[PDB]
Scaffold this active site. Structure first.
Site, mmCIF file in Angstrom:
data_model
loop_
_atom_site.group_PDB
_atom_site.id
_atom_site.type_symbol
_atom_site.label_atom_id
_atom_site.label_comp_id
_atom_site.label_asym_id
_atom_site.label_seq_id
_atom_site.Cartn_x
_atom_site.Cartn_y
_atom_site.Cartn_z
ATOM 1 N N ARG A 198 0.811 -1.217 0.000
ATOM 2 C CA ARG A 198 0.000 0.000 0.000
ATOM 3 C C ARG A 198 0.838 1.257 0.000
ATOM 4 O O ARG A 198 0.382 2.321 -0.433
ATOM 5 C CB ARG A 198 -0.943 0.036 1.209
ATOM 6 C CG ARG A 198 -0.299 -0.194 2.574
ATOM 7 C CD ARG A 198 -1.360 -0.144 3.690
ATOM 8 N NE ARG A 198 -0.770 -0.270 5.021
ATOM 9 C CZ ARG A 198 -1.451 -0.563 6.130
ATOM 10 N NH1 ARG A 198 -2.763 -0.784 6.085
ATOM 11 N NH2 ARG A 198 -0.810 -0.644 7.288
ATOM 12 N N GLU A 199 2.048 1.146 0.534
ATOM 13 C CA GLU A 199 2.984 2.252 0.543
ATOM 14 C C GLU A 199 3.616 2.425 -0.840
ATOM 15 O O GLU A 199 3.992 3.533 -1.214
ATOM 16 C CB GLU A 199 4.033 2.048 1.640
ATOM 17 C CG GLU A 199 3.432 2.156 3.066
ATOM 18 C CD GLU A 199 4.482 2.271 4.169
ATOM 19 O OE1 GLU A 199 4.181 1.861 5.301
ATOM 20 O OE2 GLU A 199 5.613 2.759 3.906
#
Lengths: 132, 129
Positions: free
Chosen positions: A74-75
């Protein structure tokens, strides 16, 4: 306030990253570099936040050594989010290799060192922070 | 008698080479690569001609491990019709240090296309021969 910070894996630090730091500084851009080496264990999101809080733009050198750090998915996907102040540069990776880590990053158009020289990339980045 | 052979450094063999071969066979193309792993003694032009005698086209995987075999500059400058290099995980500055001609030549590039798109593109060449 600086023009760029450049987040990179350490393995890239004294190769392409130093090249690009020298070329950008030679055009007169202000660039943060030393404090933005990414190591196993760091927080990408927090490192990006930190850089953006002190710079106009963020450069992330997307290389094999970058993805090998095994960042959270997600980063990685987050690097693509608009407010963009994040400018990925693809370096010695394939499309498939990037899609294996993040499909959104793999489809997000970015600079690519196989299509331009370090000088040409410097000029283009420099255009974002200069009046002409 | 064959559609493609794939010239490569040993380092790429079980990686990109494997992926490309698998993808091209899936489309029905005929490929060999096992006898075409390049070492340092080898005469790049010889190896290529040897493959072009048995195969319509020839692929050369232009990776860092290909360039690390210290090929003679003349063979690099006249690398290329029937020979199709594919850039793999290299930079322009990097290729240019071995052969400024090779770096300026338009060629396939894995940072631009998935293996499967590359396979489709190469496959369409058979049907144009």
């Amino acid at each position: 306030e600086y023009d760029f910070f450049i987040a990179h894996a350490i393995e890239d630090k004294e190769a392409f990253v130093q090249d690009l730091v020298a070329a950008l500084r030679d055009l007169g851009a202000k660039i943060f570099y030393d404090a933005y080496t990414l190591k196993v264990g760091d927080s990408l999101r927090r490192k990006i936040d930190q850089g953006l809080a002190n710079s106009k733009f963020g450069i992330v050198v997307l290389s094999e050594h970058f993805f090998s750090k095994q960042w959270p998915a997600r980063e990685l996907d987050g690097l693509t989010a608009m407010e963009t102040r994040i400018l990925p540069i693809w370096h010695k990776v394939s499309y498939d290799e990037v899609r294996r880590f993040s499909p959104s990053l793999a489809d997000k158009v970015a600079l690519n060192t196989s299509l331009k020289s370090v000088e040409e990339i410097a000029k283009e980045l420099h255009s974002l922070i200069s009046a002409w």
